[PDB]
Amino acid sequence: MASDMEEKFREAFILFSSCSDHIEMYKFFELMNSFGIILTNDEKAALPNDINMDYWLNFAKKHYNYEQPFKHIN
Numbered sequence: 001m002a003s004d005m006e007e008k009f010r011e012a013f014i015l016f017s018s019c020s021d022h023i024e025m026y027k028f029f030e031l032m033n034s035f036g037i038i039l040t041n042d043e044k045a046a047l048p049n050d051i052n053m054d055y056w057l058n059f060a061k062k063h064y065n066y067e068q069p070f071k072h073i074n
Contacts, residue, residue, distance in 0.1 A: 002061055009035070009060045013053055021053045031056070037063045 016031045017023040023031060028051055029039060037060060039047075048055065 005060070005064075006057045009057050010053055013056050023051050023056065025049065025051070028056075032060075032063075035060070036065055038067060 012031060012034060013023060016027050032039060047059070
């Protein structure tokens with residue numbers, strides 16, 4: 001379920017941010033490739049300059065892991 005998956009996102013978030021509920025923007029993209037979530041140019045332009053746990057969870061809800069299963073040659 002989403003909440004159970006949310007727990008994993010939260011734990012990873014804390015690992016990357018090391019502390020607080022906010023993640024550095026440079027440390028943010030590496031957080032997502034770890035789950036297989038890719039950020040498009042349009043989305044990067046749309047994300048708030050300060051990202052917290054909730055935004056990560058929700059953004060992760062949206063991508064989940066179905067962007068393109070077995071995405072090859074890219």
